[PDB]
Short mmCIF file of all heavy atoms in Angstrom, two decimals:
data_model
loop_
_atom_site.label_atom_id
_atom_site.label_comp_id
_atom_site.label_asym_id
_atom_site.label_seq_id
_atom_site.Cartn_x
_atom_site.Cartn_y
_atom_site.Cartn_z
N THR A 35 0.82 -1.20 0.00
CA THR A 35 0.00 0.00 0.00
C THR A 35 0.86 1.27 0.00
O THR A 35 2.08 1.21 0.13
CB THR A 35 -0.99 -0.02 1.16
OG1 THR A 35 -0.20 -0.29 2.30
CG2 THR A 35 -2.06 -1.07 0.98
N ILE A 36 0.21 2.42 -0.26
CA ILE A 36 0.83 3.73 -0.32
C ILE A 36 0.05 4.66 0.58
O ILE A 36 -1.04 4.32 1.03
CB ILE A 36 0.89 4.28 -1.75
CG1 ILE A 36 -0.51 4.34 -2.43
CG2 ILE A 36 1.90 3.51 -2.57
CD1 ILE A 36 -0.54 5.18 -3.70
N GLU A 37 0.61 5.83 0.88
CA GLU A 37 -0.22 6.88 1.44
C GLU A 37 -1.21 7.29 0.33
O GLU A 37 -0.82 7.41 -0.85
CB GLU A 37 0.64 8.08 1.84
CG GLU A 37 1.69 7.77 2.91
CD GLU A 37 2.33 9.00 3.52
OE1 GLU A 37 3.29 9.51 2.94
OE2 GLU A 37 1.80 9.46 4.54
N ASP A 38 -2.48 7.52 0.70
CA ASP A 38 -3.45 7.85 -0.33
C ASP A 38 -4.71 8.38 0.32
O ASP A 38 -4.89 8.25 1.52
CB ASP A 38 -3.78 6.64 -1.21
CG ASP A 38 -4.30 6.97 -2.60
OD1 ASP A 38 -4.44 8.22 -2.98
OD2 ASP A 38 -4.60 5.99 -3.30
N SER A 39 -5.57 9.00 -0.51
CA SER A 39 -6.86 9.48 -0.07
C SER A 39 -7.99 8.68 -0.71
O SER A 39 -7.86 8.16 -1.82
CB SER A 39 -7.02 10.96 -0.37
OG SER A 39 -6.91 11.17 -1.74
N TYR A 40 -9.15 8.71 -0.04
CA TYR A 40 -10.29 7.91 -0.41
C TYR A 40 -11.54 8.73 -0.13
O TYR A 40 -11.54 9.66 0.69
CB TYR A 40 -10.36 6.63 0.44
CG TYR A 40 -9.13 5.75 0.31
CD1 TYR A 40 -8.00 5.95 1.10
CD2 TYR A 40 -9.08 4.73 -0.64
CE1 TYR A 40 -6.85 5.20 0.93
CE2 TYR A 40 -7.97 3.89 -0.74
CZ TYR A 40 -6.85 4.13 0.07
OH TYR A 40 -5.72 3.34 -0.12
N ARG A 41 -12.63 8.39 -0.83
CA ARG A 41 -13.90 9.03 -0.56
C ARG A 41 -14.95 7.93 -0.35
O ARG A 41 -15.05 7.01 -1.17
CB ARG A 41 -14.27 9.93 -1.74
CG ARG A 41 -15.71 10.41 -1.53
CD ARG A 41 -16.17 11.48 -2.40
NE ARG A 41 -15.88 12.74 -1.70
CZ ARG A 41 -16.35 13.88 -2.13
NH1 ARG A 41 -17.22 13.88 -3.10
NH2 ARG A 41 -15.90 15.01 -1.61
N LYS A 42 -15.80 8.10 0.66
CA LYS A 42 -16.94 7.20 0.86
C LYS A 42 -18.20 7.99 1.21
O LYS A 42 -18.17 8.88 2.06
CB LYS A 42 -16.73 6.17 1.99
CG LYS A 42 -17.67 4.98 1.83
CD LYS A 42 -17.60 4.02 3.00
CE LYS A 42 -18.60 2.87 2.98
NZ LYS A 42 -18.27 2.09 1.79
N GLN A 43 -19.29 7.68 0.54
CA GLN A 43 -20.60 8.24 0.86
C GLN A 43 -21.34 7.27 1.78
O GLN A 43 -21.48 6.10 1.46
CB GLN A 43 -21.43 8.44 -0.40
CG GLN A 43 -22.74 9.17 -0.13
CD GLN A 43 -23.46 9.53 -1.41
OE1 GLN A 43 -22.95 10.22 -2.27
NE2 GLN A 43 -24.65 8.99 -1.57
N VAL A 44 -21.77 7.75 2.95
CA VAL A 44 -22.46 6.91 3.93
C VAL A 44 -23.54 7.74 4.60
O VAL A 44 -23.50 8.96 4.60
CB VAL A 44 -21.44 6.37 4.96
CG1 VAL A 44 -20.35 5.53 4.33
CG2 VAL A 44 -20.72 7.48 5.70
N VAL A 45 -24.51 7.05 5.20
CA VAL A 45 -25.55 7.68 6.01
C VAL A 45 -25.20 7.47 7.48
O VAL A 45 -24.92 6.35 7.88
CB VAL A 45 -26.92 7.09 5.68
CG1 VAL A 45 -28.04 7.71 6.55
CG2 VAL A 45 -27.24 7.30 4.19
N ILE A 46 -25.10 8.56 8.25
CA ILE A 46 -24.76 8.49 9.67
C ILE A 46 -25.77 9.33 10.44
O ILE A 46 -25.90 10.53 10.18
CB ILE A 46 -23.34 8.95 9.96
CG1 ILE A 46 -22.32 8.09 9.23
CG2 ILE A 46 -23.05 8.94 11.47
CD1 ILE A 46 -20.93 8.68 9.27
N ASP A 47 -26.55 8.65 11.30
CA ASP A 47 -27.62 9.29 12.05
C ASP A 47 -28.54 10.06 11.12
O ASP A 47 -28.90 11.20 11.41
CB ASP A 47 -27.08 10.18 13.16
CG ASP A 47 -26.06 9.49 14.06
OD1 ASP A 47 -26.31 8.34 14.43
OD2 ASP A 47 -25.03 10.09 14.33
N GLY A 48 -28.96 9.40 10.04
CA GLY A 48 -29.91 10.03 9.13
C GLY A 48 -29.28 11.04 8.16
O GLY A 48 -29.94 11.43 7.23
N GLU A 49 -28.03 11.45 8.34
CA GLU A 49 -27.40 12.45 7.48
C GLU A 49 -26.53 11.75 6.44
O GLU A 49 -25.72 10.88 6.77
CB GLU A 49 -26.58 13.40 8.36
CG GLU A 49 -25.70 14.41 7.62
CD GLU A 49 -24.68 15.16 8.49
OE1 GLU A 49 -23.80 14.55 9.15
OE2 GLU A 49 -24.77 16.41 8.49
N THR A 50 -26.66 12.17 5.18
CA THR A 50 -25.83 11.70 4.09
C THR A 50 -24.53 12.48 4.14
O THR A 50 -24.53 13.70 4.07
CB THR A 50 -26.50 11.81 2.72
OG1 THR A 50 -27.59 10.90 2.70
CG2 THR A 50 -25.63 11.24 1.63
N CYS A 51 -23.43 11.75 4.25
CA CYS A 51 -22.12 12.28 4.55
C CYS A 51 -21.13 11.82 3.47
O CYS A 51 -21.22 10.70 2.98
CB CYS A 51 -21.48 11.63 5.78
SG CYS A 51 -22.34 12.01 7.30
N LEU A 52 -20.16 12.68 3.20
CA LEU A 52 -19.04 12.32 2.35
C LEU A 52 -17.80 12.34 3.22
O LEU A 52 -17.42 13.40 3.73
CB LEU A 52 -18.91 13.31 1.18
CG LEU A 52 -20.09 13.33 0.21
CD1 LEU A 52 -20.04 14.56 -0.68
CD2 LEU A 52 -20.05 12.06 -0.64
N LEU A 53 -17.20 11.17 3.40
CA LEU A 53 -15.96 11.05 4.13
C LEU A 53 -14.79 11.14 3.14
O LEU A 53 -14.62 10.27 2.28
CB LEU A 53 -15.98 9.69 4.80
CG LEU A 53 -16.79 9.48 6.08
CD1 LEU A 53 -18.03 10.20 6.19
CD2 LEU A 53 -17.01 7.99 6.30
N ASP A 54 -13.99 12.20 3.31
CA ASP A 54 -12.75 12.37 2.58
C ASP A 54 -11.60 12.00 3.52
O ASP A 54 -11.23 12.77 4.41
CB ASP A 54 -12.62 13.75 1.97
CG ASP A 54 -13.52 13.99 0.75
OD1 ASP A 54 -13.75 13.05 -0.03
OD2 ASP A 54 -13.99 15.12 0.59
N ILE A 55 -11.06 10.81 3.28
CA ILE A 55 -10.13 10.16 4.18
C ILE A 55 -8.73 10.16 3.59
O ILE A 55 -8.52 9.67 2.50
CB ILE A 55 -10.60 8.74 4.52
CG1 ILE A 55 -12.01 8.76 5.13
CG2 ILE A 55 -9.61 8.04 5.45
CD1 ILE A 55 -12.73 7.44 5.05
N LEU A 56 -7.78 10.63 4.40
CA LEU A 56 -6.37 10.54 4.11
C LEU A 56 -5.70 9.52 5.02
O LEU A 56 -5.76 9.63 6.23
CB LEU A 56 -5.75 11.91 4.31
CG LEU A 56 -4.32 12.03 3.80
CD1 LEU A 56 -4.27 11.90 2.27
CD2 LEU A 56 -3.62 13.27 4.29
N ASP A 57 -5.16 8.47 4.39
CA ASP A 57 -4.41 7.38 5.02
C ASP A 57 -2.92 7.70 4.94
O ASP A 57 -2.37 7.74 3.84
CB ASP A 57 -4.70 6.07 4.27
CG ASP A 57 -3.93 4.87 4.76
OD1 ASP A 57 -3.68 4.86 6.00
OD2 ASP A 57 -3.56 3.97 3.94
N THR A 58 -2.29 8.01 6.08
CA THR A 58 -0.92 8.50 6.14
C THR A 58 0.01 7.43 6.70
O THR A 58 -0.43 6.55 7.40
CB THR A 58 -0.83 9.76 7.02
OG1 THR A 58 -1.02 9.43 8.40
CG2 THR A 58 -1.81 10.80 6.53
N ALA A 59 1.28 7.53 6.42
CA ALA A 59 2.28 6.61 6.94
C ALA A 59 2.65 6.98 8.37
O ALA A 59 2.64 8.16 8.75
CB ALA A 59 3.53 6.68 6.11
#
């Protein structure tokens, strides 16, 4: 694996959310 970013759309407590995630070393 590498350091990288990811996006996930999920529903959390009724709210539609976009998680912009940075996975760092």
Side-chain angles (χ1 to χ4, degrees):
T35 52
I36 56 166
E37 299 193 275
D38 204 0
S39 60
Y40 301 86
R41 171 169 268 191
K42 200 186 175 63
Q43 187 172 302
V44 299
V45 178
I46 300 169
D47 309 316
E49 172 192 59
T50 293
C51 293
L52 296 165
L53 282 35
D54 287 326
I55 303 160
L56 190 67
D57 177 33
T58 71

